[PDB]
Design a protein around this nucleic acid. Structure first.
Ligand code: CL
Ligand code: CL
Ligand code: CL
Ligand code: CL
Ligand code: CL
Ligand code: CL
Ligand code: CL
Ligand code: CL
Ligand code: K
Ligand code: K
Ligand code: MG
Ligand code: MG
Ligand code: MG
Ligand code: MG
Ligand code: MG
Ligand code: MG
Ligand code: MG
Ligand code: MG
Ligand code: MG
Ligand code: MG
Ligand code: MG
Ligand code: MG
Ligand code: MG
Ligand code: MG
Ligand code: MG
Ligand code: MG
Ligand code: MG
Ligand code: MG
Ligand code: MG
Ligand code: MG
Ligand code: MG
Ligand code: MG
Ligand code: MG
Ligand code: MG
Ligand code: MG
Ligand code: MG
Ligand code: NA
Ligand code: NA
Ligand code: NA
Ligand code: NA
Ligand code: NA
Ligand code: NA
Ligand code: NA
Ligand code: NA
Ligand code: NA
Ligand code: NA
Ligand code: NA
Ligand code: NA
Ligand code: NA
Ligand code: NA
Ligand code: NA
Ligand code: NA
Ligand code: NA
Ligand code: NA
Ligand code: NA
Ligand code: NA
Ligand code: NA
Ligand code: NA
Ligand code: NA
Ligand code: NA
Ligand code: NA
Lengths: 115, 147, 149
RNA sequence: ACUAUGCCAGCUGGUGGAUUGCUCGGCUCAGGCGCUGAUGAAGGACGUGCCAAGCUGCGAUAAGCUGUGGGGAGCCGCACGGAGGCGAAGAACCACAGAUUUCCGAAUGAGAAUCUCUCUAACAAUUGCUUCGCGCAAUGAGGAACCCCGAGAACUGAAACAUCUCAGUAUCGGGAGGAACAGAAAACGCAACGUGAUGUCGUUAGUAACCGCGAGUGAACGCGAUACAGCCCAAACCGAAGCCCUCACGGGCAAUGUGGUGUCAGGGCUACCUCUCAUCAGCCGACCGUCUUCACGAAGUCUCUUGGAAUAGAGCGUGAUACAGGGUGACAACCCCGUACUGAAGACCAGUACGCUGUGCGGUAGUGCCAGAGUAGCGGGGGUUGGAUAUCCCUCGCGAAUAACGCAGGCAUCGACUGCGAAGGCUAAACACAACCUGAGACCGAUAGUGAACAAGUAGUGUGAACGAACGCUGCAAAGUACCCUCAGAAGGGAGGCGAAAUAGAGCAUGAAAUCAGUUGGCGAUCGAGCGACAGGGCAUACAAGGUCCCUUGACGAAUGACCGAGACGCGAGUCUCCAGUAAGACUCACGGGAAGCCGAUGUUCUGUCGUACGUUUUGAAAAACGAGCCAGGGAGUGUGUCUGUAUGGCAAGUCUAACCGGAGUAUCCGGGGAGGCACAGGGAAACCGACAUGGCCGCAGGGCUUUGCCCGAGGGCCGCCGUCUUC
RNA sequence: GAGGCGCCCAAAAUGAUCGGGACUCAAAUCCACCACCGAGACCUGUCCGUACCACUCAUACUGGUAAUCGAGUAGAUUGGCGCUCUAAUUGGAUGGAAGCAGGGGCGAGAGCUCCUGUGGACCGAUUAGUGACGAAAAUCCUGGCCAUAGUAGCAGCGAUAG
RNA sequence: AAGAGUGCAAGAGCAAAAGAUGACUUGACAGUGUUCUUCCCAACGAGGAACGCUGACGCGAAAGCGUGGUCUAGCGAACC
């Protein structure tokens, strides 16, 4: 099914973290990533700006894109970011990989899922 | 088969990176003894003429055993021989230079020669298998940086 | 393994009775045959509707919504005219495929969060109101004023 | 122990030619190149060899003659024979040039199925020039397609069919070239203060347009590319200042106009100013590149083992600007050809580019001097096209103006505006094809691939047009079997010889199945037919590649589950209670003993149970529904375009390049190229107008909290609101 | 008057039947009763597949659940076997490759593999590709072959020819 | 209490009426919908019906009635 070996590794790591540190978000994200690419999140910034609050990490089971404006200072964790998205986010906040999210927060506390 | 430029360019960069990983390179099957890969070399390599000179250099770099691996031919099963496809051999060492490819190295068993500006995925990863044992010229090594 | 790869041995390759998969009778006639009779379902109904004006008397407007302009002012500041806590932008310079169009028109979708002075050939009423209510102004190009007559 | 005629399976030997391996042939792609013929081509006929039937070559000089260059010690084609010859007087062989080149054939003195006739005489026929004489010339016919100009279907699609479609296709008539055609605006019409000959490629676009408004059909301008190139007449004004033939004399043409000028940058004339640039006619005349051919070209033929043979194994060495490919008695960079490098030639580019000679460009003012007629245009009737009142063409009829005029800008008329100058002509390069040369391949591999790897358009069929196969493989070396016996025998057989092998012995590598001969095992002349599956007996079995199996006893022991005996009940068959969930109970295991045709397995046969093939048609098939004698081999979802989903992957308010350009390791690949497409805003026939970066509620996942309940809640769901059309 | 069983009514074509033999206080019929036989059903041991659960990167292992899973034409869905040639990685062969014949082992199976003989030069595996890729059938195509069968014909004619 | 009548088949509906008589009046109106039917379930056009609204009217004291005929037949695409 999946041909990207890094996507598979990501998914395997998300499961290991959910089964141990009890973060149910990571399991939820793993299952969505296992679903067809078609269903994966593609989120622009306007959507993150609208639903995010500070000191709550935004989690995108998918990829973050660059339309819209992000003022809020937030940590956004995603499978990938467009070049523009990562640049706009790093100005007011922090763009981070899901692999880092799992490291800093294996229990998946204080996160909000956004698609 | 069509391929997006971005997607192809990504694979070029990715194959480049695989040459820097000694475990990957040994996994691919290349024979050599050293911790550090790819092998980088003085630009004077480009002024070499005789094949034997390259041999000595490679022997001195502990890398010549790959040439030994590639020096043997397989006479293939099946009817390809009737079409001129009788033979094949392992791939050994990719030599990446800057000005022009290396006539001195080219006839070494299994060797390929390439240039930093046009070196491609097949060069870096014959048969799509990443981690080819490579020698870069210092200038080549730098030129490849922007590919 | 593909579906197709599994057909050998099946005899009918998924076609049902071997009496199916013959000529065009199996499809109700060639192409759109029957679109008014046995196959009428889900075809547009028959007939003639409306008229067309000659391709050469038609004008093509290049359009942009204020939202696109406004979301981008900071990045366009690196390029077009920041002045007055305010921004001045000639819209013709912003819009892709402007020169290939008869005129440039600013439309009113979304919000204006800055004070903007906008130059274009035409404006929707809503684009004018939003740009003014944000304490900005709308400047009709010479060509824009010609359009009044 | 017998049993024939037979059945099944093997064994030995055939038959047969599958299979595997092999490739002197195909198929396809790519680069180069490209006309021949009256000076008789192409094609065909018949000849031609010491012996010569076929093919090839050649032409009475006849597998060939001559010259130059190359090449080289051999040679006398395919073709390995017998004889004989040629070559150092440099043959063979290759390149270029020349000689010879029968008859028919456009076929041309005339006739004729390849021969003949005559005034030794003929370009027949048509035609130009013409010394009016066939004196000088032209045409004819061929060619793989490509190209241009004419004539022009039908099956088919529309589920019938007529317009439409198939299709201006198939096919027919005429004709050119290496390419053809087109081509320097009476253009375009993103309408402009814009573009600027033509073709082609990519796009514009399945858009505009057509259409029983059905099915279908279907451009252009523009843009990005490729390649680029612009000119000559007619007339005005001049008026013989001219041209053709001939060595020359001389002849012919030409006032019905040869020649000068000139050609929208309008020109001419008149008067000026200025220039030697444009154009045109000439002369010279390539580089590089590309295609093909050629010269030169490094390094082992060392040791042991195996083998008929090392090109194998093991060991020791070597070259590489050369480790492409091939050959050689088996896997070869180093044995031979070649390959890298370097160099030479020919061909194409091209009589082109550059260079040069001659000519002379251009400007002002004046001048109604010149500027292409059955035309432009209109009507009748048709064809064709996307061309719609607005395509292009044919036919019949009518029919202008004269630059102070005329045509076009997709209905007509008038005015304005913008463009342009028809009714004369030429024109390089970029593009098509594939005969020819060469190269290439995830193509086929002898029932395939061409019809054709072979005598292949052969053998053979048809009056003819036309139709049309099958046939590849000894061996390292022919060492291709001497001698002897047999025989009617140059047969065949026996014996023998060669070779690693003859079961490699001549259509000879391998050598399947159907099937045949002989023979082995099993059955067998009292017995019944989907031929078997499963279980179990009997007989049969060299090894190998499987090693199990039998019997006594014991352990474990699911469901199930007793006898006898005792007590009680029933007319009776029998039942109940207890012995007892006991003994028993499939598999598995342990001790002891045993089997080696022994266990499995395989062949055949016997017994039990079940069983009227297979595939198809069918409501229903063993069917008295359809198909096949048997076996081998062959034998059926494929390509382009478009549309719509899906899975995976890149990038993301964007995304992708197309043709094409440059580079290079030269079809790959690296870098350019965003023309253009889709997406980013919709609604409306059109004019035209032009939207929620979130107001409210519910709430899954997830998160939070003081947790069995509260909170936040993307996505989702329900509203509200906004753009537009219709709308008093 | 009612009921039970039988009798008459009662004729068809090759050889009569209750499937047959045959049966008479039945081996028939009716009322009851007793013990048995007898499916792949039901119960039960072990294994297999499928679905689901726990653990896990992954049933790759391991453990667990199914009384409420296990038939199937057309058809939809999904894992796998085999064939050609390409590529990468990597092996085998004259101390005998492929093919073929006979035989041994594995796999539910497509098919894999070994031994012996023959053969005498080539042949694989894994991964990613490729496609003129799999036959029991079409009055299918071509070739070969058996029975038919030592059979029909080699007589017939106004010319019986030795 | 319904056998009459209510245009026409058959079945249904109707009595201070849906019938009869008299009078007045043109709602047999324009625009646009919801819904059912057509086509049970279950997609499909024309057509039909039920029920609204907006506008304008008729009648009535008014509530109200009038979306032709008490109800179910009386109907027809594109092109032109
Ligand atoms: Cl979004
Ligand atoms: Cl916040
Ligand atoms: Cl329009
Ligand atoms: Cl233009
Ligand atoms: Cl067991
Ligand atoms: Cl025991
Ligand atoms: Cl199919
Ligand atoms: Cl499987
Ligand atoms: K990124
Ligand atoms: K021309
Ligand atoms: Mg093979
Ligand atoms: Mg259909
Ligand atoms: Mg553009
Ligand atoms: Mg003649
Ligand atoms: Mg039809
Ligand atoms: Mg027709
Ligand atoms: Mg029709
Ligand atoms: Mg047409
Ligand atoms: Mg146009
Ligand atoms: Mg002149
Ligand atoms: Mg037509
Ligand atoms: Mg053939
Ligand atoms: Mg005939
Ligand atoms: Mg043989
Ligand atoms: Mg007997
Ligand atoms: Mg029937
Ligand atoms: Mg076959
Ligand atoms: Mg089933
Ligand atoms: Mg591998
Ligand atoms: Mg079949
Ligand atoms: Mg036959
Ligand atoms: Mg007989
Ligand atoms: Mg007689
Ligand atoms: Mg009514
Ligand atoms: Mg009514
Ligand atoms: Mg009609
Ligand atoms: Na189907
Ligand atoms: Na069929
Ligand atoms: Na149809
Ligand atoms: Na219809
Ligand atoms: Na443009
Ligand atoms: Na040529
Ligand atoms: Na001959
Ligand atoms: Na000749
Ligand atoms: Na002539
Ligand atoms: Na004459
Ligand atoms: Na039809
Ligand atoms: Na018909
Ligand atoms: Na039509
Ligand atoms: Na006409
Ligand atoms: Na025009
Ligand atoms: Na053959
Ligand atoms: Na037996
Ligand atoms: Na049938
Ligand atoms: Na059958
Ligand atoms: Na029957
Ligand atoms: Na027969
Ligand atoms: Na096939
Ligand atoms: Na673009
Ligand atoms: Na099925
Ligand atoms: Na309706």
């Amino acid at each position: 099914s999946k041909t990207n070996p890094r996507l598979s590794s990501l998914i395997a790591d998300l499961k290991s973290a959910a089964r141990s540190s009890g973060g149910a978000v990571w399991g939820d994200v793993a299952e969505r990533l296992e679903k067809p690419r078609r269903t994966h999140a593609e989120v622009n910034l306007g959507r993150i700006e609208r639903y995010a609050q500070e000191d709550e990490t935004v989690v995108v089971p998918g990829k973050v894109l660059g339309s819209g404006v992000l003022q809020k200072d937030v940590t956004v964790a995603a499978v990938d970011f467009s070049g523009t998205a990562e640049t706009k986010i790093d100005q007011v906040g922090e763009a981070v990989s899901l692999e880092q999210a799992i490291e800093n927060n294996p229990e998946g506390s204080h996160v909000r899922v956004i698609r | 088969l069509d391929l997006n430029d971005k997607e192809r360019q990504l694979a070029v960069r990715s194959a480049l990176a695989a040459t820097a990983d000694a475990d990957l390179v040994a996994d691919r099957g290349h024979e050599f003894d050293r911790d550090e890969v790819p092998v980088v070399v003085s630009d004077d390599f480009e002024d070499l003429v005789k094949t034997q000179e390259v041999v000595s250099l490679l022997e001195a770099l502990d890398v010549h055993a790959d040439i030994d691996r590639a020096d043997e031919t397989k006479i293939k099963a099946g009817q390809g021989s009737a079409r001129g496809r009788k033979y094949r051999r392992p791939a050994s060492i990719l030599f990446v230079t800057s000005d022009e490819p290396s006539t001195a190295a080219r006839n070494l068993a299994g060797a390929d020669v390439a240039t930093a500006s046009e070196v491609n995925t097949e060069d870096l990863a014959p048969g799509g298998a990443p981690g080819r044992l490579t020698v870069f010229t210092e200038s080549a090594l730098a030129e490849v940086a922007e590919r | 393994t593909s579906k197709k790869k599994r057909q050998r041995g099946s005899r009918t390759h998924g076609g049902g009775s071997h009496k199916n998969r013959r000529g065009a009778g199996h499809r109700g006639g060639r192409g759109d045959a029957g679109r008014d009779k046995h196959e009428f379902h889900n075809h547009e109904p028959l007939g003639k509707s409306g008229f067309k004006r000659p391709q050469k008397v038609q004008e093509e407007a290049a359009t942009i919504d204020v939202r696109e302009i406004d979301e981008n002012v900071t990045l366009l500041a690196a390029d077009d005219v920041a002045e007055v806590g305010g921004f001045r932008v000639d819209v013709r310079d912003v819009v892709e495929e402007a020169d290939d169009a008869d005129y440039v028109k600013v439309l009113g979708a979304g919000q204006v969060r800055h004070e903007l002075t906008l130059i274009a050939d035409d404006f929707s009423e809503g684009a004018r109101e939003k740009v003014e209510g944000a304490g900005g102004s709308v400047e009709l190009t010479d060509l824009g004023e010609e359009r009044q007559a």
